[PDB]
Every structure is written in C-alpha cells, then in structure tokens.
C-alpha cells in the first residue's frame, strides 16, 4: 500500500526488482487487490470498459485524420485501380537521401507509407468522397471519445455509482442490448445506406444540408405504408453500371440480386441494405423475449431449470447454472471470448470469398493482410476463452451448488474426453505425416506416379450442391430438376450461380488432393490445441500427481522436485503450451491461403496443384521462391522500397530467436551470475559511490515463461507480416 503496488502489500514489501515486474503484471486483476469488495470490483470494471471505448474511438479518429491530412484519398477515388493509397507520412531524421527518394510513392511530395488496411475502399463504399468528410468524421470521433471519458468519470461518482444488483440484471440488460445495440444500430445503418451511400454510388451527393429534401426513392414511403414493398426493387443497377457515376444506374434501393457488381467485383449495395434491414427486424423482435418490469416475457432461470431430460442421462440437467453464470465473471468472459473468436474466424472466412467493399479483391496485398490479421486475432481470442474458463474452474466453481448438473458431469468423465481427444490427435498426426513423408520419398526417387493422392470428394460434393458444375456430380443446385433449384431460380440463383461458376474469383475455389491434406493438417492442429486447453481446464482443480491444486491458484511455478518432479504443472502452463500450438495452426492456415491465392493471382494454379502434395514442394516453391524480392530489399548495390520489410523480416527472425533464451535456460544459472555481478559492483572504485535501491534478482519462473512466449510471439508475427506484405507487394499479382 505504501510503495508502488498500492493494491498489494506483499509486493510492496518486496525488497527486490521483482516488485516492479509483478506490480506491472498484476495491476489489472482486480479480484486479487487488497480489501476488494464486489461492488468496487463491478464499478471499476465498468469505468475501465468506458476507458477502452474511448481508446478505440480515438484510434479510429486518428486514422481518419492522418488519412485526410497526408493521404491521396481523392486522387485514389478518381482512379481506384491505378493509385496506391497512402497511410501516413514519414519524418525519420535517421534516413539518408536514397531512402527519401525510394519512399516517395503515390502522388506525394515526400516519403509516405502505403496503406494495407483497406480503409480507403471501406470509406469510399459508404459515401465518403473528399477530405472534408474525413475531417468531419475525425472531429466527431474526438467528441465521442470525450463523451465516453466524461461518462466514465461521472458513473464513478458517489451520486451516480450503480449498485451490485444493477449489474446482475441479466434479463433487462439482454433485452436492451439485443434490441437497441443490435437491431436499432443495424436499422440506423440501413438508413444511412439508403439515404446517403446508395445515391453516392449513382452520382448523387447527399449531405446534412440536403438530407431533408433528397428523396431516397421517387415515391418515398408511399408504397411502404401502402403494403407495396416490391416497388422499392423495380429498377436495380445495370450490369454496365460504373460505380460513382450515373451511367446505367437504377432507382431501386432494396434489391435481392445476389452475386457481385461486375465493375467492382463486390456485393451489391442494395443487397446489403435489405440484409441489414432484415437483421434489424429480427433483432428488434428477438429483444422482446425476457421478463422485465411489465409482467410479460420468459425467465431465464426457469428455462434452465425446466430443461432437464427424464431418465437421468444428463443427471440433474441445467439446474443451478443460472447462479453459477450470473455470479461468475470468468464464466461470462469465457463465453464472450469463445463467441467472439468464432465470429472473427467467420469474418475472415466470409470476407475473402464475398468481398463487400468496392475495388477490394483487386488489391491483393490488402486482402491477404486482412485475412491474416483477423485470423490471428481469432486464434488468440480462442486461447483466451479457454484460459479464462480454467480460471473459472479454479476460482468461482462451487461443487455443492452444481451437484450432478451438466457442469459437474463434465468433470465426471474428463478422463474419457482427454483419452478420445488424444486418440484423435494421434490418429491424424501419424497418418497425415505418413502420407506427406511417403509422397516426399516417391518424388525423391523420381517416381511421382506412386504417391497417394486422395480426392476430397466430400467437399467437392458440397461444392456441387452449391451449384458448381465442374465436378459433374449434378446434385441439388447443380441439378435443374431439383426442388431447390426450381424454388430459387428467380430470386437469388442467377447471380449466385454466375458468381460461383466463375473461376477467376475466390468464391468456392477448386480443390484437389493438396487441399485435402492441408485441411487434414488443420484438423490435427485444432484437435491438438483443444486437447491441451481442455486438459488444462479440466485438470485445473487437481490431479493424481497433485490433488490439491485449487489451493495454489491459477498460476504457480511448480510443486518442487518431489514425487518425481512437477514442472509446468498448473493450468497457466497448459495455456502457455497451447499458445505454441495455436501459433503453429494459424501459421499452417495462413500459409495455405497465401500460397493458393498467389498461384491463383499469377494464373499458374498448376504449380500449387502439383507441388502442394509433398513438403519439399512447399519449402521450395512457396518460401524460397517468394523470398527473393524480400531478401533483396537492400544489398551492396543500393536499396528499394522493400528495405523496411527486409529489415522487419530480419528483426522478426532475431526476436523469435531471442525468445528461445528465456524458453530453454532457467533461473538458477542467472541468479548465481547476478550474485557474482553484485559482488563485482560493490568492490569497484568510483562505482561504489552509486548504490541500487532494489536488490537485483533474476526473473521468476512464470515471468520467464511469459517473457519467452512474448518475444516468441512478437517474432512470429513480425516475420510473417513482413514476408506476406513484401512477397505480395513486390509483384501485386
């Protein structure tokens, strides 16, 4: 309390440098602070969430301002396919003149950075056209962040502090959040689309000054209240429409065309409008479900209690889970993180194949960057979901209240779960690695016709069920006699079939034996990471080796060398181990995506179709082949604009290597070395005049694991980001 860790006495009284490290590392864990009550915990969390919102909005405002100030948004808008967007300017005093010449891209007057976030396409699609629009948005977002800061400060005041019962009103919070935050927000977005952005793509200009007089439709709101909702879809945009101009432009606002806009190769705007309108209606209806102050609606506890199978196969069913979830913040955090990870993976998978932004899918580097970014985010989020679930088992789980319900019966057959997961992982690993090595041996001996190439007929059958007429399966949407084809042949199927039978886009790419092998390696990675995380979560409360782990908390180094040795015994260590597998799996996924799309964009898909069936093919035709321009960023003959990416590549290799030092070498060596260093310092003339305040010590065991994992992950991310950006920007194809 006296010293820096004001929230911890044990850390405050520590005389070593461990105090600073652990005060930093445990600052944002409010349940562990001294004299912490539930009410203070909830209010502090609520204010911190306000602060996070303010930070997010300031980040967006900064992007907008820097693009409006130093970017060529208007020049890019004039010629989207021939101008490189500008992220921010460069002012580095350490440059030399050749670098200043090399980084002057775009139409800029000085060195700049080319943007790969895709915000140009997103802002252009939603109606923003000039720099004044971006400036207005930046100022507005500054105001919004200020509003959230004021809100946090106010709702922390004694008069305005909410009570603990307010934070536990699940039905009312879910009712408002589901109705407003989802349905009304999507309804407002549909309003923006219809009222502003659709006219922009047809050569109109609608702003705040003429919003009240510019009709979205020639006969506005007449048919809507007359029941003639089909009037708004009469005249869609033509296939010869030019985005941003009135050439071949329709007047419909809610079409249901399906497919892609031919000029921009993205989804129609009116499709997106009807989509967000339907989503808004569904969410607003779904909000009016749970009971509140008006005496109608369902009650979530009664729903959980009623659902319980007779015959006792599930035990007591979902009984008692309401209080377990309401009183545990870690259970809620785990559920939210799992859902968010699934949703992020969905975003990544569904954005590369159905691009929503005009001019995207022609900026190859942006597409690759977006995919990799959100996929790595999803992986980290999933690992966090499992970690905070393990924290729930250790901290908030009460065995007596969850007597014989589903939650306890999960702990009941945990050995069966872990055993069958181990079997699945072993099976996938053995037979997949065996097939890869067998193919390697076959091609090494000069006989590539002896390799085991298995056709992925299930995924091909699914593709044919979608209407792809390449594999000759002739089922469902591929069959003209099917009821589904006849039912959909007028609403959405023309455009959808035209898009899915095109072999130039990324909508249901053609697949072969290599794709089969890679999806199987991905399945191996998923089941193995799940094995590690589930083993950590279920064995968190105790095992045969240490039956009282729940008394030692979530994170602790070990239990000593007794009983054979107990290194890496806590559930935190299972998190630590599973992070490596998560990184490896996401690496496999991104490697596969990037190589397939490189071959697609160069037009040479045969190289992937032939070289992906063996591992030497990967190592030779992906990495070594595509690292040429990257490693030639700077050489004894000068430097290119890829110099920064080459430097980042080497930087990532170096940081990743440095992480190994913390990962492999442990503490006692370093502690003794520091002891010798302290002796040396105390005995040196002109240096004894200076004394340390904190006694130097080596890092803790858990701290060493964390620092090694951090250096490792940073090196991983920076290396792959540099390689991806350079290998896709050197060619742009």
């Amino acid at each position: 309390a006296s010293r820096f860790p004001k929230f911890s006495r044990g850390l405050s009284q520590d005389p070593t440098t461990r105090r600073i490290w652990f005060g930093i590392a445990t600052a944002h864990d409010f349940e562990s602070h001294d004299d912490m009550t539930e009410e203070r915990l909830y209010q502090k969390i609520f204010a911190s969430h306000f602060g996070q919102l303010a930070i997010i909005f300031l980040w967006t405002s900064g992007n907008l301002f820097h693009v409006a100030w130093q970017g060529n948004f208007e020049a890019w808008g004039q010629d989207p396919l021939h101008v490189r967007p500008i992220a921010h300017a460069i002012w580095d005093p350490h440059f030399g003149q050749p670098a200043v010449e090399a980084f002057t891209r775009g139409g800029a007057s000085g060195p700049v950075n080319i943007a790969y976030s895709g915000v140009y396409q997103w802002w252009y699609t939603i109606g923003l056209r000039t720099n004044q629009d971006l400036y207005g948005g930046s100022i507005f977002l500054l105001f919004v962040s200020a509003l959230f800061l004021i809100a946090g400060w106010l709702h922390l005041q004694p008069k305005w502090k909410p009570s603990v019962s307010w934070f536990k009103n699940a039905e009312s919070r879910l009712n408002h959040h589901l109705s407003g935050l989802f349905g009304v927000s999507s309804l407002a977005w549909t309003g923006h689309l219809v009222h502003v952005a659709i006219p922009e793509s047809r050569g109109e200009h609608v702003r705040w000054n003429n919003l009240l007089t510019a009709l979205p439709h020639p006969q506005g709101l007449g048919p809507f209240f007359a029941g003639q909702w089909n009037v708004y879809a009469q005249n869609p945009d033509s296939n010869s429409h030019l985005f941003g101009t009135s050439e071949g432009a329709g007047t419909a606002i809610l079409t249901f065309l399906g497919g892609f806009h031919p000029q921009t190769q993205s989804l129609w705007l009116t499709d997106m409008a009807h989509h967000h309108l339907a989503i808004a209606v569904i969410f607003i209806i779904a909000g009016h479900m749970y009971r509140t102050n008006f005496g109608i609606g369902h009650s979530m506890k009664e729903i959980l209690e009623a659902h319980t199978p007779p015959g006792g196969r599930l035990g007591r069913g979902h009984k008692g889970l309401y209080d377990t979830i309401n009183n545990s913040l870690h259970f809620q955090l785990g559920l939210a993180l799992a859902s968010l990870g699934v949703i992020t993976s969905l975003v990544a998978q569904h954005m590369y194949s159905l691009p929503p932004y005009a001019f995207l899918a022609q900026d190859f580097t942006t597409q690759a960057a977006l995919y990799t970014h959100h996929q790595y985010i999803a992986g980290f989020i999933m690992t966090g979901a499992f970690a905070h679930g393990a924290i729930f088992f250790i901290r908030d789980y009460n065995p007596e209240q969850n007597k014989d319900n589903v939650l306890a019966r999960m702990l009941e057959h945990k050995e069966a779960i872990i055993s069958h997961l181990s079997w699945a992982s072993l099976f996938l690993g053995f037979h997949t690695l065996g097939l890869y090595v067998h193919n390697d041996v076959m091609l090494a001996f000069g006989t590539p016709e002896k390799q085991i190439l298995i056709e992925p007929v299930f995924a091909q059958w699914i593709q044919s069920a979608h209407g792809k007429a390449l594999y000759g399966f002739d089922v469902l949407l591929s069959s003209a006699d099917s009821p589904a084809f006849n039912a959909g042949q007028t609403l959405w199927l023309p455009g959808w079939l035209d898009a899915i039978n095109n072999n130039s886009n990324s909508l249901f790419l053609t697949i072969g034996p290599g794709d089969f092998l890679v999806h199987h390696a991905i399945a191996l990675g998923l089941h193995t990471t799940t094995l590690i995380l589930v083993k950590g979560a279920l064995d968190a409360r105790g095992s045969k080796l240490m039956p009282d782990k729940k008394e030692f908390g979530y994170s602790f180094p070990c239990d000593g060398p007794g009983r054979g040795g107990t290194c890496d015994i806590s559930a935190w260590d299972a998190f630590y181990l599973a992070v490596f597998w998560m990184l490896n799996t996401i690496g496999w996924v991104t490697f596969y995506w990037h190589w397939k799309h490189i071959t697609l964009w160069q037009g040479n898909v045969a190289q992937f179709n032939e070289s992906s069936t063996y591992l030497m093919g990967w190592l030779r035709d992906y990495l070594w082949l595509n690292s040429s321009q990257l490693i030639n960023g700077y050489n004894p003959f000068g430097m290119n604009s890829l110099s920064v990416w080459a430097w980042m590549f080497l930087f990532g290799h170096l940081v990743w290597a440095t992480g190994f030092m913390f990962l492999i070498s442990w503490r006692g060596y370093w502690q003794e070395l520091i002891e010798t260093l302290a002796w040396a310092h105390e005995r040196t003339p002109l240096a004894n005049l200076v004394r340390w305040k904190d006694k130097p010590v080596a890092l803790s065991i858990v701290q060493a694991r964390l620092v090694g994992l951090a250096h490792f992950s940073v090196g991983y991310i920076f290396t792959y980001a540099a390689f991806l950006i350079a290998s896709t920007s050197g060619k742009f194809g």
Binding site: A47, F65, A68, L142, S145, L156
Partner: protein
C-alpha cells in the same frame, strides 16, 4: 478538391488537448 486548412488543424489539436484533460481526470478517478 480539398486539402484541409491550417485553422482546421488548430481546432483538431485544441480538441485533442481537451480530450486528453478529460482522460487525465478519468484516470485520476480510477486510480483513487
């Protein structure tokens, strides 16, 4: 065709300073 005026930059900087003061107040409230 627009290029952002200098007075616009002045306004943005002043607004950012005010937002920073508000953030300082919120952080002080959280710490105490």
């Amino acid at each position: 065709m627009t290029s952002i005026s200098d007075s616009q930059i002045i306004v943005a900087l002043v607004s950012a300073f005010i937002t920073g003061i508000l953030a300082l107040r919120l952080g002080k409230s959280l710490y105490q």
